Design a protein around this ligand. Structure first.
Ligand SMILES: [Pd+2]
Ligand SMILES: [Pd+2]
Ligand SMILES: [Pd+2]
Length: 223
């Protein structure tokens, strides 16, 4: 659809495609999100965009998500997921990433919580993760840079762990739970007291364009 509004959702349980321009007031430009194929078996979609000014600030996060029942990270058996995407015009400042949120209380909004786990499949321009690199780890057969940082806004101190690949991975498959398992044994992540609440995948656009981000297919499940 031309659901190029501020916040829009198209869902076919348990999947959804979400247009999210939560930074539309920091720069200037336009962005629409189009659904190509959406059913209970997966999501395929694309978004075109152009943004200027307010560099260093994410203007939007178009993404596909999967709805599921809040459950303790330590109770998660596996998070299988696969994706195939492509970025048309790399002369921009944006990233392609999986975004996972956990909170110490399921009775908390899904916008944040305590921890955010970003798995960067691509990094364009001069943008970089929050905080500093604290390690490099091998997860799911691949090498990732582990970054850690914590931002506090409106009193919401949020801890972010970012796994970044050296080069773009257009075709990825893996068990995301492996990242949680790594964080629990190597970075003190409190798995037995954190509820996985949100799982999304998409792109954060800072500046640049016209550019097109396409997700040929996307699947994700939380067990
Ligand atoms: Pd649209
Ligand atoms: Pd289009
Ligand atoms: Pd992030």
């Amino acid at each position: 659809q031309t659901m190029c509004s501020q916040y829009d959702s198209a869902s076919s349980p348990p999947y959804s495609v979400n247009q999210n321009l939560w930074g539309e007031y920091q720069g200037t430009g336009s962005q629409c999100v189009y659904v190509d194929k959406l059913s209970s078996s997966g999501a395929s979609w694309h978004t075109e965009w152009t943004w200027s000014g307010g560099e260093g600030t994410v203007k939007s996060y178009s993404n596909s998500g999967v709805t599921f029942n809040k459950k303790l990270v330590s109770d998660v058996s596996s998070i299988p997921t696969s994706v195939e995407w492509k970025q048309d015009n790399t002369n921009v400042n944006a990233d392609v990433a999986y975004d996972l949120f956990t909170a110490a209380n399921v009775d908390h909004a899904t916008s944040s919580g305590d921890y955010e786990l970003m798995i960067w499949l691509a990094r364009y321009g001069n943008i970089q993760p929050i905080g500093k690199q604290i390690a490099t780890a091998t997860v799911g057969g691949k090498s990732w840079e582990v970054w850690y940082g914590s931002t506090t806004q409106a009193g919401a101190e949020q801890r972010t762990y970012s796994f970044v690949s050296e080069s773009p991975i257009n075709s990825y498959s893996g068990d995301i739970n492996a990242f949680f398992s790594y964080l629990t044994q190597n970075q003190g992540f409190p798995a037995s007291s954190q509820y996985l609440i949100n799982l999304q995948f998409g792109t954060e656009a800072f500046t640049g364009g016209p550019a097109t981000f396409t997700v040929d297919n996307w699947t994700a499940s939380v067990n």
